[PDB]
Nucleic acid binder design. Structure first.
Lengths: 106, 106
RNA sequence: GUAA
């Protein structure tokens, strides 16, 4: 409810970037309405938030070819997959760069 | 391996705590050999490490009643469930406290 | 463990 998502689509994946107002409470997970995504594509998840949030979100996209978790130092780290990307693989993405010009956070 | 686990087992869950040497690289996920756990029980995961490690780990226990991700400020945040516990619920455990006296990290 |  009080947390907004952005959904950027590319051929090889759909990036999902979240933004959080202030501190969050775990209770909020009961109410998050997760962006719907093209299931023929792996997903990359980014956003500044605590670990539980990321884990929660990553799970919710498990039915997809893969889930990669962004890390500004490295890129997007595959953490689970059903595709030819393997866990530990790194997708070259720079999120700070893709979000230039600014993106509507729905 | 570069990474050791501890498993503390309790009626209402199996706590899994990890410890990491150095800065890890994502490659390592190809090699982690995950502790096998009583499936009649949810799991709690704790350890200082990057997000992708946690997310990876949490996924790997998804076959259990639930997965909760530890947070020293709050307790253990459920992030997946097939038991009574709901996502966003908080299990009351203090890991810094349960590890007093030292626990063999296998 | 609020992008170790």
């Amino acid at each position: 409810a009080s947390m907004k998502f952005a959904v950027i689509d590319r051929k090889n994946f759909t990036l999902i970037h979240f933004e959080i107002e202030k501190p969050i409470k775990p209770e909020i997970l009961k109410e998050i309405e997760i962006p719907s995504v093209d299931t023929r594509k792996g997903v990359v998840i980014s956003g500044r938030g605590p670990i539980w949030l990321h884990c929660f979100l990553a799970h919710k996209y498990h039915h997809t070819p893969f889930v990669a978790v962004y890390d500004p130092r490295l890129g997007a780290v595959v953490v689970q997959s059903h595709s030819e990307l393997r866990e530990g693989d790194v997708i070259d993405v720079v999120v700070e760069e893709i979000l230039k010009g600014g993106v509507r956070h729905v």
